[PDB]
Design brief:
The structure is a homotetramer. By secondary structure, chain A is mostly beta strands. Chain A has a single domain, classed as Jelly Rolls (Sandwich), CATH 2.60.120.200. Chain A is 2% helix and 43% strand. The first copy, chain A, has one helix and 16 strands. In chain A, strands 1, 2, 3, 7, 10, 13, 14 and 16 form an eight-stranded antiparallel sheet that branches. Chain A is globular, with a radius of gyration of 17 Å. Strand 9 of chain A pairs antiparallel with strand 9 of chain B. Bound molecules: methyl alpha-D-mannopyranoside (4 copies), calcium ion (4 copies) and manganese (II) ion (4 copies). The site of one manganese (II) ion has 6 residues of chain D, from strand 1 and strand 2. One manganese (II) ion (MN) binds next to strand 1 and strand 2 of chain A.
Chain lengths: 235, 235, 235, 235
């Protein structure tokens, strides 16, 4: 089955499957049940920015989410990604809606990956500060589309700008990413994306994710709403 | 047919199809007949480095090739790549052998591409300082292989290290590259690679190329030897 | 005397000292009389962005200035900066006002410099996306201040936000920049800055400059208004 | 007094002041007595590479040191550098010798620093892959010299290539570095350097350091040998 590592911007408390009782950011290691969460004060309709960082020396996967002028939310978890993920992965963003909804709009997305073994590390770096209708270097899955106002729309939003329920969508970068190998000395990656989460009715759902998966990964069956498009069950 | 822009490290004078009468670097715009060439003193069996640069403001495509301690060879040509290439391309290295031969060994390859329209340019950057036997982010065509001594071998070299005749090989980066669009303000790219050209008998052939092509490009039929794997005829 | 290379955003036609009869961008090589100019439609009070690029292979210094949704203005000039500038320089922004005025406000400023001689080039890169009141890595000269709304104010603006006449100001990066040497193979630099030019009365003056100078350079006497803070006379 | 954070490549066991009884890498937080050490198998006369990384989200300062083909040594320590260092610092390398000696030769040194508050982080990046006799962007202190074989020699080495006793030397980058501020959201830095440690007699001393200090820092009196040029006492 897929091997998934993710940072989840979890907008909807699913307390029956281990969510804390408040919107949160979490680190997910091959399970929707986050290994660590921090309370996240989502600001409806504002543009937020997420930064994620890892290196094989410290073996600490960190994420921070912030809005303008507001306090940040940070979460970290000590995990040896070398032992967890395959040597070759694809990187991506995912989002879902359920009975409740939200725009899962991505305004920009940047990613850097380095793999060392003399400074001769191998590196991959990409930055989308703007998305075009034909984004050939993105693999779109599910309901995700590109082009609308130069944005990446992970979940189904009707033409009026209203978000739809029970949507799922993902975008993976086209090239595969080399994140470890047998001989490896140091590896590190770094990811950032700006997002816009708007929900009209009382509360939004279900969230946005930055994730790392085996190269052939696609939306698992049953992965909607609270499973953020990454996992088939809630184990 | 393919749309090809290339910088050729032309090791073998094909004077009957417009080569100058000496090894040369050239800028090729949709023809093997270089728009501009400079004399290039190849040093058999040495490691050389090539740097290529372009931006849409100056509209000048430049290349320099150098060996340690030795004088460099530089060539430039004013060309509006916006008007010449498609908006989406793939980037690559090619090499051939003919009746004469050479190792077309690539030790490293780095590439940067930026596309602007606030500093929010889109960017792609990759660096192979080392090639592994399974290089999933490279599309190998023809006789090109990866892994041997951490190198990219574009043309057929027998296990002993001897180069074979009438070989052709190319490697293109897996992700497509966005190099222009309708709205574009500025675009630029930058490429560098280290290569090792060894030939035992008197003189080598045929050369190495860095090239930019339509995404679906493959080795055209009839493109061996003097056509460096890029062109079907010598027009 | 100082050795100055600059890209000038010349907002005020000084036709008596060789300006064209319209606001323009220009390339200045040790003289205020631009070696090449392009017509520039300044948009009062809008945020514009300038990109400048050079490399020692093509020997073509280019600049582009653009505003949102509007056509760009581009200018290029073939010049061998190796032969023109000293091996060690400082890089900076300058601006002036005269009898007419303008805000010469800098919102961001990024600069990259590379010097090569194996990919072992030397490099300097800095980015100010925000300026703080105590910007210790900037050398402020003349009327330039830092901090106001996170901006760099090159020329005197009164506390109300109104620009003052006969101001001059420059900011140079604190570290010296190594842009060539005897052994050099390739060198290149790249600079970008976002600026805000507002003038209330009919027309603004005098302009903004990105420049490269000998390390000890300061505002020459007599360099105000039309001499943009770079040159003592109009030769 | 100076505020010092450093990663020490400690070649000589000073067990009387808390060193483990073997050469080690350590993380030093305002004391020569390392907060954490790892055993380091130094290879006399080989070229080694050190990588150091920190970010304000994970608050984990990591270092790895490796030689070709050999196992690496890694060390980490959870420390909130925001609370420890001043907002403005200088970054540098230091080295010493004592009764025993070693070449403290630096072949290359690269450093990246980012400070965020939209992707508009402030950044400083420099890379010396080669040092020239007149390195104007380095502040040399003590016995450190630049130019010899394109290398940075931190401690006194006689013209023959033999290392001298009771030497001390440091090099700091010329520009000050902005590593935090009141408004800050995220900060991170990253440093790498290649070094050559050769000692003829039985064992070398005393070590090499990458350090971060208040901008005006200089070699404290009494800081030789085992105090690696950073600290006046061994507290
Ligand atoms: C009733 O719950 C549904 O709606 C919530 C919120 O959208 C989801 O978390 C969940 O998976 C279901 O799809
Ligand atoms: C006889 O010519 C052949 O050999 C030379 C040198 O290899 C090639 O340039 C050419 O295309 C042919 O294949
Ligand atoms: C009368 O001219 C003055 O004003 C213009 C416009 O500001 C400047 O160009 C010039 O140098 C003088 O200072
Ligand atoms: C006797 O000790 C001296 O020599 C060792 C090894 O060089 C140093 O650690 C120490 O500071 C002294 O200078
Ligand atoms: Ca949830
Ligand atoms: Ca030829
Ligand atoms: Ca003028
Ligand atoms: Ca010691
Ligand atoms: Mn959750
Ligand atoms: Mn040719
Ligand atoms: Mn002018
Ligand atoms: Mn120690």
């Amino acid at each position: 089955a897929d091997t998934i590592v993710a940072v989840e911007l979890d907008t909807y408390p699913n307390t029956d499957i281990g969510d804390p009782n408040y919107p949160h950011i979490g680190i997910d290691i091959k399970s929707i049940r986050s290994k660590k969460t921090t309370r996240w004060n989502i600001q409806n309709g504002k543009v937020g920015t997420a930064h994620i960082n890892y290196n094989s020396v410290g073996k600490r996967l960190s994420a921070i989410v912030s809005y303008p002028n507001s306090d940040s939310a940070t979460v970290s978890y000590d995990v040896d990604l070398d032992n967890v993920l395959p040597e070759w992965v694809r990187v991506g963003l995912s989002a879902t809606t359920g009975l409740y909804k939200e725009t899962n709009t991505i305004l920009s997305w940047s990613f850097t990956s380095k793999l060392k073994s003399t400074a001769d590390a191998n590196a991959l770096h990409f930055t989308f500060n703007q998305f075009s209708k034909d984004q050939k270097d993105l693999i779109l899955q599910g309901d995700a589309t590109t082009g609308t106002d130069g944005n990446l729309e992970l979940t189904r939003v009707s033409s009026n700008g209203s978000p739809q329920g029970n949507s799922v969508g993902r975008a993976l970068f086209y090239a595969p990413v080399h994140i470890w190998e047998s001989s490896a000395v140091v590896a590190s990656f770094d990811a950032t994306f700006k997002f816009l989460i708007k929900s009209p009715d009382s509360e939004p759902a279900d969230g946005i994710t930055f994730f790392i998966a085996n190269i052939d990964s696609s939306i698992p069956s049953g992965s909607g709403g609270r499973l953020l498009g990454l996992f088939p069950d809630a184990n």
